[PDB]
Structure 1
Amino acid sequence: CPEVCTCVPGGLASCSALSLPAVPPGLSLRLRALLLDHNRVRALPPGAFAGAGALQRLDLRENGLHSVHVRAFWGLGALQLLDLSANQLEALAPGTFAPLRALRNLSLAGNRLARLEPAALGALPLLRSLSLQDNELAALAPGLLGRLPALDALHLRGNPWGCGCALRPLCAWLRRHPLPASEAETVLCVWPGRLTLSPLTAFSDAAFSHCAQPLALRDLAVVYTL
């Protein structure tokens, strides 16, 4: 379909290692499973993939993306594979993944996201797995993990975490099922004080700490009358 990339026998698909600071033109329904590697796509316009009726795999590898529109993915409709790793996104625009209801797979590896909005992520009920490898984010909101019902595996290798309340949900998620597949996958939790050091694998799941109960009624009765 793209003039620059030779048409793939069978179902039309994009070419790898394409050298093209310009987006592939001539998109259509026959074009499926776009592959972009080492390209220079600064931004995604709204309705970027409207021409392609349905797509299976989207892979944005080594592409410098610094601004994604809220409705840039209006056209996808029923996308299954999409990996968002090693990208330059500062933050996800709200409602970006709302059309991505059928997105089975998504991974976030090496994204310099300061914090990702749970509203931007959306429900994504049919999510097989996710990753958080080498991401600049250090605090994960409990809502982000609570929104996804069917999430199974989360990769945290290469991204040490800060011990505190922000760790309480994640380890609780670890309490549901073990995230480290191998002993070499374990990572340590960083502390504000340099004197103390601890690995997250040695960190007890749902371990008691300060502010263990966010709210209660027994103490609510007495703080209303003390």
Structure 2
Amino acid sequence: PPGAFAGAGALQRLDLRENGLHSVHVRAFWGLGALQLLDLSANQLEALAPGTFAPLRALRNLSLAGNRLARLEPAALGALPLLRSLSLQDNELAALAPGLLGRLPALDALHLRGNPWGCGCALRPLCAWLRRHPLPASEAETVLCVWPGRLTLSPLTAFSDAAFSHCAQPLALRDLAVVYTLGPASFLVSLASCLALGSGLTACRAR
């Protein structure tokens, strides 16, 4: 319920696992931002309303293991500068929205073991974060991803910038100018070529 833990303004630790939670209302942690550890593992959570973790400010390590989450909205997590560790292992997450990791400064510890990650352009920010923050070798071996159309033998950390080269970055002013000018320039070139051919044929005939 909203304001479920009201009166515990100085709470620091909060653990809720093996409870089978299935629905958490938005703004249910009003005044609970003081906590630093939050365990919501071993539940049946599927969707998180945006702004649920917004009142939390001093939270450091967050766990969401063993849940039914499919899409993790960046608005739900928000910006938590004091966060240090986050866990999403044993879930049903397929891809992460770009820029979600860039909202918060410190994401030193991350666990993504067992998620059905479908490697793709979307996962490229996560792969870049792996390049910046290398995982432990055992965790790198355990965490894998699904390659559509064939075997899932490709490790998540084995990808490099060559895979990122396929992704189309937002176009700059040069590409915008070129795609704006391709049409009229091509039409003028065609008109000039036809006019030159006609003038040359007229000159040859008049000779």
TM-score with structure 1 setting the length? 0.73
Tell me if structure 2 keeps the 8 A contact 1:133–1:158: yes
Hey, which of these two has a bigger chunk of helix by percent? 2
| C-alpha spacing 1:100/1:121, structure 2 compared with 1 (3 Å) | same
| Structure 1 unmatched runs, 5+ | 1-44
> In the alignment, is the contact (CA less than 8 A) between 1:157 and 1:185 conserved in 2?
no
**Which residue of structure 1 lines up, in the alignment, with residue 114 of structure 2?**
158
Partner-residue secondary structure (3-state), 1:106? strand
Question: Given that residues 35 and 58 in structure 2 are in contact (C-alpha distance below 8 angstroms), is that contact kept between their aligned partners in structure 1?
Answer: yes
Q: Identify if the C-alpha distance between structure 1 residues 207 and 184 changes in structure 2 by more than 3 Å, giving closer, same or farther.
A: closer
For residues 132-180 of structure 1, the C-alpha deviation after alignment (integer angstroms, 9 at most, x for no partner) is 2111111100132121122212111222421111111100110111023
SS state at 1:182 partner: helix
Runs of 4+ in 1 over 6 A off after TM superposition: none
1:88-140 deviation line (CA, Å, top 9, x unaligned) = 11111111111111111112212211112211111111111111211111110
In the superposition, relative to structure 1, how do residues 192 and 122 fare at CA in structure 2: closer, same or farther (>3 Å)?
same
In the TM superposition, what is the alpha-carbon distance from 1:184 to its structure 2 partner? 6.5
1:122–1:195: structure 2 CA closer, same or farther, 3 Å change rule? Answer: closer
Instruction: Count residues in correspondence.
Output: 180
Q: 1:87 to 1:184 in 2, by over 3 A?
A: same
* Helix, strand or coil at the partner of 1:171: helix
Unmatched segments (≥5 aa) in structure 2: 181-207
TM-superposed deviation, 1:49: 0.7
Structure 2 counterpart of 1:203, from 159, 177, 185: 159
Preserved CA contact (<8 Å) 1:97 1:120: yes
Distance 2:140 2:124 in 1: 23
Bigger mean CA deviation after superposition, 157-166 or 136-145: 157-166
Q: Report the CA distance between 1:52 and its aligned residue.
A: 1.6
- What is the SS of the residue equivalent to 1:54? coil
Residues 115 and 172 of structure 1, relative CA distance in 2, 3 Å threshold? same
Partner of 2:71: 115
Q: Larger radius of gyration, structure 1 or 2?
A: 2
User: For the aligned residues, what is the CA RMSD?
Assistant: 2.0
Q: Does the 8 A contact of 2:65 with 2:89 survive in 1?
A: yes
In the superposition, relative to structure 1, how do residues 223 and 116 fare at CA in structure 2: closer, same or farther (>3 Å)?
same
Q: Assess if the C-alpha contact under 8 Å between 1:160 and 1:187 holds in 2.
A: no
What is the rounded CA distance, in whole Å, between the counterparts of 1:51 and 1:196 in structure 2?
Answer: 49
Asked if 2 retains the 8 angstrom alpha-carbon contact of 1:92 and 1:116, the reply is yes
CA–CA separation in structure 2 for the residues paired with 1:133 and 1:205: 25
Taking structure 2 as the reference length, the TM-score comes to: 0.79
Once the 2 structures are TM-superposed, how far is the Cα of residue 206 of structure 1 from its aligned partner? Answer: 6.5
Q: Matched residues, percent identical?
A: 100
